[PDB]
Paper text:
We optimized crystals of l-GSTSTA for microfocal X-ray diffraction, starting from dense needle clusters and ending with single needles. X-ray diffraction from a single crystal of l-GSTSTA yielded a 91.7% complete data set to approximately 1.1 Å resolution, while data sets from three crystals of l-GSTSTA obtained by MicroED were merged to achieve a data set with an overall completeness of 86.4% at 0.9 Å resolution. Atomic structure solutions were determined for l-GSTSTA from both microfocal X-ray and MicroED data by direct methods (Sheldrick, 2008). During refinement, the number of atoms in the X-ray structure increased to 36 peptide atoms and one bound water. The modeled water molecule also appears to be well ordered, particularly in the structure of l-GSTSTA determined by MicroED, where it has a B factor of 3.28 Å2. The single coordinated water is hydrogen-bonded to Ser708, the C-terminus of a symmetry-related strand and the backbone of Thr709 in the mating sheet. Homochiral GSTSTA forms a class 8 zipper in which two in-register, antiparallel β-sheets meet, related by a 180° rotation normal to the protofibril growth axis. Side chains between neighboring sheets tightly interdigitate to create a close packing within the fibril; the inter-sheet distances range from 5 to 7 Å. The l-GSTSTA protofibril appears tightly restrained within the crystal structure, as shown by a mean B factor of 0.92 Å2.
The ice-nucleation protein InaZ from Pseudomonas syringae contains a large number of degenerate repeats that span more than a quarter of its sequence and include the segment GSTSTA. The ice-nucleation protein InaZ is produced by P. syringae and localized to its outer membrane. We chose to further investigate a segment whose sequence, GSTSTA, appears identically five times within InaZ at residues 707–712, 755–760, 803–808, 851–856 and 899–904. The benefits of racemic protein crystals for structure determination by MicroED were evaluated and it was confirmed that the phase restriction introduced by crystal centrosymmetry increases the number of successful trials during the ab initio phasing of the electron diffraction data. Both homochiral and racemic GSTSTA form amyloid-like protofibrils with labile, corrugated antiparallel β-sheets that mate face to back.
Residue numbers in the entry: 707 to 712
């Protein structure tokens, strides 16, 4: 799983 924001 992965989650990234900007």
């Amino acid at each position: 799983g992965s989650t990234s924001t900007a």
